[PDB]
Amino acid sequence: LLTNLSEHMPNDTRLQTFLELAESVLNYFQPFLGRIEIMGSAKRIERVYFEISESSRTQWEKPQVKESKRQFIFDVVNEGGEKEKMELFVNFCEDTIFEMQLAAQI
Amino acid sequence: TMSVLGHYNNFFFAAHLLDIAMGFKTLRTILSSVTHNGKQLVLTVGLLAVVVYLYTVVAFNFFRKFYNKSEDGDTPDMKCDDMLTCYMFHMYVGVRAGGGIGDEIEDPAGDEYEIYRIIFDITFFFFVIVILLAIIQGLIIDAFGELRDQQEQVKEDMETKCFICGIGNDYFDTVPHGFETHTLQEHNLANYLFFLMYLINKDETEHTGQESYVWKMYQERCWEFFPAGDCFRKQYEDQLN
Amino acid sequence: YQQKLLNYFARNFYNMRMLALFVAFAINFILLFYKVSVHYVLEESSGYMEPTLRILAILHTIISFFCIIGYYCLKVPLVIFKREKEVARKLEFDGLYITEQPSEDDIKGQWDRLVINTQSFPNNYWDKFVKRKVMDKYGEFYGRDRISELLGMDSAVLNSIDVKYQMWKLGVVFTDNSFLYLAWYMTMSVLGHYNNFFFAAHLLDIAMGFKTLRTILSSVTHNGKQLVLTVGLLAVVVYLYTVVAFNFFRKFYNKSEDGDTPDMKCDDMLTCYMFHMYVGVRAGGGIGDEIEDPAGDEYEIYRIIFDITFFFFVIVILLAIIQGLIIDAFG
Ligand SMILES: [Ca+2]
Ligand SMILES: [Zn+2]
């Protein structure tokens, strides 16, 4: 809520004081908080703040995931076909979710 | 298979050294350069074969006394009489020597077939060696260079262009540390991954408006919720521009 | 039946070409199984080789004749229609033979001048009324008489078959590149029966197949003037080196078999020039790899400078330039 208020309201000294009061909790909840912009609903850019688990972040840095990410990036920006770009990005997302689930069995 | 066969004869372990080529990237690029231009290379080798065959036919018909590859003259003569021996001689020694088939054939001095022999020699050397060997070498080298250039272009596009949202570098860089912060926090990749995983994990009843909309679009496999050249800084222009 | 056979040949054409290529491959294999002793085919205890070669040569000649007939039936009308359309549109819109009198060289227009005064000029243009429009406008301007004389409007027995038009058609047929190539194919296939080695030249038909072969062949002529001029520069610089060697270093050119034999030297101009253009430009290092070693002679530094300058200049610069010209044309 504090992040949403600070980003949506750029100029407010009261919110600034609240931020200088809660900077510690903001720093703690920074690795867990995401930020994503979509076209979803209406015709404007929104923000989709959500939660990231510790396990998802600690399994993203596995060597298999890094190799798969490198291969996907190379194969999707080399040839591209820039609608299959988004299609294969979603497919790579699903495959990497499956690989994180598999790597959870450690 | 090779490791098992190594116990039969303890020399098949030499083939395991080629595993170093599946390690470092530049070795893989060098190996893939051979097959990157495959059809053109095979067809050029075929053209080399047919032109060497034409030269073989001409030499077989006209200049046969010159092919006396004997050990200093008066020995049991080892000539090239039949078609197959001449063809193997031309494809084995002719295409390799630095100057053509003239570096091994006896010197044509005094014979009536002197100008014809000289033309044969020069045309062979020039055409087959220069043009075809240089063309094959250039094919392989240009394949290697093209692959390296493609990799460099991929890296440059990743370092100067927004992967999603497709804007570029000169737009976000108007503020200090703009593009790096944009890629790190705003339009990230692992963030989109974690958001998809979060949508899959959560129940359908607890989805908010945006989450339910994104879930519906993803279920229908209809991707317009991704940015298509617009961002927060463009639509919601800071303090409304 | 004649029309049916002609249409059948015009239908199956590329199949006939592929058949000709395969038969050429088989004949060249049989040729690869030769041996001298006079020329007789060595056969591995199988006397079928010579009858196979004979029937393959006969069938190849027949297939090539079918190929040329099919090409004449298929694509000659395209060339005829294109030329008729061009000349008719030119004569209508602009008008060459009536009020322009085309240029001095103008070989296409000079040959097409023979077709305007024919009774079947628009045989394929499907517009056999351009004569009326041309006669109207250009006879109302330049008089009707000149238009009438120039245009010439006014059992299967011989109806004169428009002999002038047939001659014009044959003249334009014996100019297209593909027809000339097929005529050369006919000539080589016919000559193959005289000596059964001319079928080797039919292997070059593979170069008119796959595209990259055609690009490789066209790379030689893509840079034509520059290549010829560079070869000429190579010739003149080798001639200058020949003049210098002729004047000064003549005792060094003792290309004799280990010394004390009947001396085979290079004394006159022509022998030295052929020696330089035959051995000098080919060896990896220049003319120094064959000339006797210049140790102890008073002309030592001059000879070394001659050798190094020859090697460097002609070999490096000119051979690399020619090779780069051809490779850059291909690229
Ligand atoms: Ca709900
Ligand atoms: Zn972006």
Coordinates of C-alpha atoms in Angstrom, one line a residue, chain A residues 7-8 10-11 30 33-41 43-52 56-57 60 69 72-74 76-78 85-87 89-94 96-97 100, chain B residues 150-151 154 157-158 161-166 185-198 200 210-211 213-214 218 221 223-228 230-233 235-236 238-239:
Chain A
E7 CA 4.4 5.7 -6.9
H8 CA 0.9 6.9 -7.8
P10 CA 4.6 11.7 -6.8
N11 CA 4.5 15.0 -4.9
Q30 CA 11.9 -5.0 -1.2
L33 CA 7.8 -7.1 -3.8
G34 CA 7.4 -7.2 -7.6
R35 CA 6.5 -4.5 -10.1
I36 CA 4.7 -5.2 -13.5
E37 CA 2.9 -2.9 -16.0
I38 CA 0.1 -4.3 -18.1
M39 CA -2.7 -3.1 -20.5
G40 CA -5.2 -5.0 -18.5
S41 CA -8.7 -3.4 -18.3
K43 CA -6.9 1.4 -22.2
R44 CA -4.2 2.5 -19.7
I45 CA -1.0 1.2 -18.1
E46 CA -1.5 -0.1 -14.6
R47 CA 0.7 -1.6 -11.9
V48 CA 0.3 -5.2 -10.7
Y49 CA 2.2 -5.3 -7.4
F50 CA 2.3 -8.8 -6.0
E51 CA 4.3 -11.2 -3.8
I52 CA 7.4 -13.3 -4.5
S56 CA 11.0 -18.9 -6.2
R57 CA 13.9 -16.5 -5.9
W60 CA 15.7 -18.9 -10.1
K69 CA 17.1 -18.7 -19.9
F72 CA 15.5 -19.1 -24.8
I73 CA 16.8 -15.5 -25.0
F74 CA 19.1 -16.4 -27.8
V76 CA 13.8 -15.9 -29.3
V77 CA 15.8 -12.8 -30.2
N78 CA 17.9 -14.3 -33.0
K85 CA 8.1 -13.9 -29.6
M86 CA 5.4 -13.4 -27.0
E87 CA 4.0 -16.9 -27.5
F89 CA 8.0 -16.2 -24.0
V90 CA 4.8 -17.6 -22.3
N91 CA 5.8 -21.1 -23.3
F92 CA 9.3 -20.5 -21.7
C93 CA 7.6 -19.2 -18.6
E94 CA 5.5 -22.4 -18.3
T96 CA 10.7 -22.7 -16.4
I97 CA 7.8 -23.0 -13.8
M100 CA 11.5 -24.8 -10.7
Chain B
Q150 CA 24.7 -12.7 -34.9
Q151 CA 25.8 -13.4 -31.3
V154 CA 21.9 -10.5 -29.9
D157 CA 20.0 -5.8 -28.7
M158 CA 19.7 -7.1 -25.2
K161 CA 16.6 -2.4 -26.3
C162 CA 13.8 -3.2 -24.0
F163 CA 13.0 -6.9 -24.5
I164 CA 9.3 -6.5 -23.7
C165 CA 7.7 -3.1 -24.3
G166 CA 10.1 -2.5 -27.2
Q185 CA 12.5 -3.2 -11.7
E186 CA 9.8 -2.0 -14.1
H187 CA 9.8 -4.3 -17.2
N188 CA 11.7 -7.3 -15.8
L189 CA 11.6 -11.0 -16.8
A190 CA 11.8 -13.0 -13.5
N191 CA 9.1 -10.6 -12.2
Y192 CA 6.8 -11.7 -15.0
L193 CA 7.7 -15.4 -14.3
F194 CA 7.0 -15.0 -10.6
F195 CA 3.7 -13.2 -11.3
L196 CA 2.6 -16.1 -13.6
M197 CA 3.5 -18.6 -10.9
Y198 CA 1.7 -16.5 -8.3
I200 CA -1.2 -20.3 -10.9
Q210 CA -6.4 -7.1 -12.6
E211 CA -5.3 -10.6 -11.6
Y213 CA -8.4 -10.2 -16.1
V214 CA -4.8 -11.4 -16.7
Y218 CA -3.9 -16.2 -20.3
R221 CA -4.3 -17.5 -24.8
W223 CA -1.9 -11.7 -25.1
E224 CA -2.7 -8.0 -25.2
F225 CA -2.1 -7.3 -21.5
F226 CA 1.7 -7.2 -22.4
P227 CA 2.9 -3.7 -23.1
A228 CA 3.1 -3.0 -26.8
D230 CA 3.8 1.9 -24.0
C231 CA 5.0 2.2 -20.4
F232 CA 4.1 4.1 -17.2
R233 CA 6.4 7.0 -18.1
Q235 CA 1.0 7.0 -20.6
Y236 CA 1.1 8.3 -17.0
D238 CA 5.2 11.5 -14.4
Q239 CA 3.2 14.4 -13.1

